């Protein structure tokens, strides 16, 4: 769990008051070598009945089911990863699958088909540099998605802005209102500052990471 590292990285950037000091030189904090490998491109909240389905940017699809199990279909459309409630990981294929997983596979295929047909692909214009969804929650303002590689993604509903936080790179990717996809080193935002918009979202992010840490 790299959540503690993430919280520390956010504590540090926020404490530097990046938008409240001198000349903001945000462009100097950009680091394309830190562009994430994975993020959530689409999601469907069917948690009142089945669970939460998501598409990663590589076109792989996962579901976190209401029974606390996870099923992930690789982008080849056949290879499967199943994670039981106790945490046991199994690797198989749809072509071979146990009869006991037929229902969950079918559900996943419906999720997959819907996302492929109906939703915008977040970061669609970007070539990325397999994690599963550890957990998620929603607020009035955002959906928060925690990936098993330590990444935390926050999608804001009102303005469609998004953060992808990676504690391994100590980086943040910001997708703005114009769908501009920019990756920054957090330490460099400390060094060079950032706009009020990103600064406010990083403050929000800290609160969300606290929530993740307090509900582990």
């Amino acid at each position: 769990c790299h959540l503690s590292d993430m919280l520390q990285q956010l504590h540090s950037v926020n404490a530097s008051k990046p938008s409240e000091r001198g000349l903001v030189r945000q462009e100097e904090a950009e680091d394309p070598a830190c562009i994430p490998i994975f993020w959530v491109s689409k999601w469907v909240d069917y948690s009142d009945k089945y669970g939460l389905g998501y598409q990663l940017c590589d076109n792989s699809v996962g579901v976190l089911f209401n029974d606390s199990t996870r099923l992930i279909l690789y982008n080849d459309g056949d290879s499967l990863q199943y994670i039981e409630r106790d945490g046991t990981e199994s690797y198989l294929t749809v072509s071979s699958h146990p009869n006991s997983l037929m229902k969950k596979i079918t559900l996943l295929k419906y999720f997959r088909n819907y996302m492929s047909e109906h939703l915008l692909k977040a970061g669609a214009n970007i070539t990325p540099r397999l994690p599963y969804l550890r957990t998620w929650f929603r607020t009035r303002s955002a959906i928060i998605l925690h990936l098993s590689n330590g990444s935390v993604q926050i999608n804001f509903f009102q303005d469609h802005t998004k953060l992808i936080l990676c504690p391994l790179m100590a980086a943040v990717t910001y997708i703005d209102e114009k769908r501009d996809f920019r990756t920054y080193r957090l330490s460099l935002l400390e060094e060079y500052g950032c706009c009020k918009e990103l600064a406010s979202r990083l403050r929000y992010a800290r609160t969300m990471v606290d929530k993740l840490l307090s509900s582990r």
């Binding site: 689409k42 909240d45 069917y46 999608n155 509903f157």
Partner: peptide, 7 residues
């Protein structure tokens, strides 16, 4: 609340 991401 929106039950899915942006269309």
């Amino acid at each position: 609340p929106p039950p899915m991401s942006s269309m």
